[model samples]
Target: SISKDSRIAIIGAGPAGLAAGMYLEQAGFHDYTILERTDHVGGKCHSPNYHGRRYEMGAIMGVPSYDTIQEIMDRTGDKVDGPKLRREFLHEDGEIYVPEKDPVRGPQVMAAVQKLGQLLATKYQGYDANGHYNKVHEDLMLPFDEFLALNGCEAARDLWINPFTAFGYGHFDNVPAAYVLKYLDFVTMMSFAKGDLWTWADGTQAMFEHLNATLEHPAERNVDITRITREDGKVHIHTTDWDRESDVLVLTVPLEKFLDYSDADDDEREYFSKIIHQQYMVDACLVKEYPTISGYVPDNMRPERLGHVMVYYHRWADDPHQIITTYLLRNHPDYADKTQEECRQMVLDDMETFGHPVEKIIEEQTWYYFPHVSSEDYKAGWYEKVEGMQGRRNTFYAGEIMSFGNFDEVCHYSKDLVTRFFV
Candidate 1:
């Protein structure tokens, strides 16, 4: 256990860091500080607005079983509401297809996937021969695409591809099916057949704001991180505003950022640095009217834009304007210098291709996002390396990547890390 007066510095005011701070505070440790480079608290849980209509810049949904988020909501006196995301599938041939019934045998394949998930979740809940636990199955680490094919579920590939990609977890060609089971079946009791998703009525941003207010230590925002080094048994944080040292450093940022800012050697960053990630971009805009693409296949949509257009219909149902969000798997060739209007136009062009034209452009924001895992990395002791990194250099980690990129799972892992090592 740490001393009561031990100084702990948390980098990134995301869910993980914030939750870490909360747990530390609960454990009678109040001398810690949280630093965020951005002006906001929720790292990828960003909720912004367009002309007074709420839209999401990052995470949008908070599933029912997300106890950590629920805990925050309970503390903040907030409520949850469901998302009315009308499904639309436009195929390669410009034909509108029923989303549930695929060209091939869809139902049968889905049943197989669900049964497999249940089997793994129930049968393998104990230690394995490889000396790893139940969830870390070698067979389950196959790429989702390959896994489906191997299990004779190839016909239902598109079913998983579209929804998963919309949630920022890249295509079937990348993610592992084991990730699906661990994320949905084990955590939320949701499956591919029927997804249950919801968001805050006010906005996810408000939830984070309330959390910040509830926290005794206000986050130091907009502080550019320069260096994180350890010397003489203390971890030092060098930022633009001020320099601080602590007995423990909890980092909730991505591996790339951690390597770039911290004094990690090439070997320290190598294991995760080689994992491939797709370029996922999130953008928001307000349309004149709600355009429907209810049954059209994505044949006409760009290869780089093969995801969902999340229209915020829950809150804006009665409102005249519609808040719509989009995900771009690959940025435009000139993404760096592209103007907001250009990005809006680019998404609008894709919408028009899918037969849903934009009536009016309110606002747009492009976010660089990371996606699924490489099977090679998973098999090559990716998680083992991550586990080894724990407590090294008096530093600890918490976030989505360590927990397979889900909100509830990340929070659970963060809380568990706090309990296991700190408290």
Candidate 2:
């Protein structure tokens, strides 16, 4: 049994940190404190208001796989709305295609995509002693680009890869086949097929506030943690304000962020070295009438088709007039440094290209987002080593990077850590 009176220091009050706190309290442990560096409790799950209307800036919609999050919402009395959306691909050839409306090609391609996943599950991983498809197909560490070519799903290559990468990894060229298969098979297909996307009535960030309301020990925000050390059977935390000590510590931030501040003697280089990271900047803006790509699709589909939020304001929000949000990738050297005004101009430049009304940009902000799997590092065993680091020195790790950068995964990973160590 876990000690109910043990002081637990949780870093980064995101979904994962809060989930850990929730689980610990339910288990009768209340001696804990959540250290959030930001002024607010929500990490990437942030919502900023523009002209009295709110919009999502980071970690926006909730997919159906978010069972853990759904349960949290239910207990907190938070209400969510499901929006039926039409998703289409904007191609460089001055054409937009609704993959589903293609009728012939859409059905054929979706079938192949589904079958590839089913094939891996029933055929390859089915034979593995561990029953994990990743280990079963672990030998190849196949890149998603090659996975598509090998499977001969030409139609899937056309439409699905973009959606897959836009949500799972930044680009398709380097992520492993195992990871893509896991996402397609387990996480998304059914949801996309149904065109189902859900969000809170207020904004995505409200969900975190709801979760925060349930915590026994309120999160302490704007506390910068500078040093961490294990001594005298306790974990000592040094922050900008006051130093605190706890029997155990949970790190729910980026692995690199924690490692950068940790005591040199606590280094777990054997495990941490394998993980690699990249950056994505999501620019959320509230704009007056925006333009949709006109004449891209035939008159049959929706008259003016918008893009999906995952692909950056592919369409408007429930407000009917508001663009959900736009995201810019840090793939370019100049993108990260752009001022808010400059970012708005960058978006307007695209609007001009699409022949939309270049309206006024009311508000915009950026989120440092998304983590990726490097081919060489993953092939050399990144995930396996991280898993082995659990339960070391009363220090534990939990976050999006601990699983993938998904809300459900972070919550689930945090819950599992409770069961494995705290419980």
Candidate 3:
């Protein structure tokens, strides 16, 4: 059990870590320290400035179903005042790709979506819960494509692909149904369909930056934690400059990297080893001439076209001179050896194919995004086993891997963790 005076140490200054700090403070546990390896906050919610306005290089937008994020924003006095986005679907051959006007197809898709909602409300009662502790359904362990097919919801694929795959969650054929349903829950999908989305005027990273400003103990940035040892009901964290002792340690970093800094036990090693990530890449550049609206190239959203640009955003529609960002997944399960330089050229070629050649590349980033397990591991009680280890050796885990890997989901997981243990 934890007390108000217990010294807590949280690793990583991402949404998970920062949100953990905020929730802990709210729970009257102010004696907590957040350590970040990076100099900046908002781990994957990275936003950088160009010309005066900030642009998203990582997480771009959120939906109204992001209630936890909305609460955090309200608590920090931030607003979602970003520009409204309008998207255009384009074929790989530079032609506008509009959905078919077939009445039957449209109705089928709608019916499928309605049925999925019904199933989720009943059969998968806790499917959208914060963490996957004993909520695993055998059907959800199947790949998303199979899950949809088995449930006669295949028609909903067209509606989900843009938000799921093009937004960098990886192809549905590979990702588990649990992840797909958890991320694109009925409410989130409806928000996307209705264009009820939110973006920060200052960029997604600003939310965390603001929250960090309100923390009792803001994150200690550039902390290169060399080793962590748990013994005698205390956690000893060793960084380059100093060593600190805490009564509890909350790991908000990617578990796959935990072994690099700590002597993880066999259970931790086994479970974390099963986690894999997507090689999601983002490029912000100047395009010679392109439509002001954001575009999605569904034609290239497949494993075969792994590194091709799938989506490009024209964030500031009014400013023609502002940079446009392009996103792609460089690695597929089958194409694991793709090089970064090769993917960069492929993105340039893709832009040219879209008839919007790149004038200049401003910045590029390849992130290890969306850590998750295969259906095999997820079905084998991976989440339950990991959840059972919470508070073992005075350590608790909170991060993207604990829940779905979205801005809101990660923050929600942190809030849930604090509520479950700290309070």
Ranking by lDDT: 3, 1, 2
* Model 1 lDDT tens row, 35-86: 8888788777777766665667777776666777898777667778634445
lDDT of 2 by residue, 26-112 (tens): 777889888888888677777776556556666657667677788778777777763434555544332455666778887877777
lDDT of 1 at 76: 69
lDDT of 3 by residue, 23-72 (tens): 99998998999999989999988889999999999998999778899989
Against the true structure, candidate 1 reaches a TM-score of: 0.85
* Pairs clashing within candidate 2: 306-314, 307-314, 307-315, 308-314
lDDT of 2: 0.61
| Displacement of the residue 107 alpha carbon in candidate 2, Å | 5.4
Question: Every model's Cα RMSD, please?
Answer: 4.3, 5.3, 1.3
Q: Per-residue error at 281 for model 2, in Å?
A: 2.2
**How many angstroms is residue 277 displaced in model 3 relative to the true structure, after the best TM-score fit?**
0.4
Please give each candidate's TM-score.
Answer: 0.85, 0.83, 0.97
Q: Give the winner by lDDT.
A: 3
Q: lDDT, candidate 1, residue 92? A: 44
* Collision pairs in model 1: 89-296, 90-296, 90-297, 90-298, 91-296, 91-297, 96-295
The candidate that wins on TM-score is 3
Quote the positional error of residue 34 for candidate 1 in Å.
Answer: 0.8
State the RMSD for candidate 1. Answer: 4.3
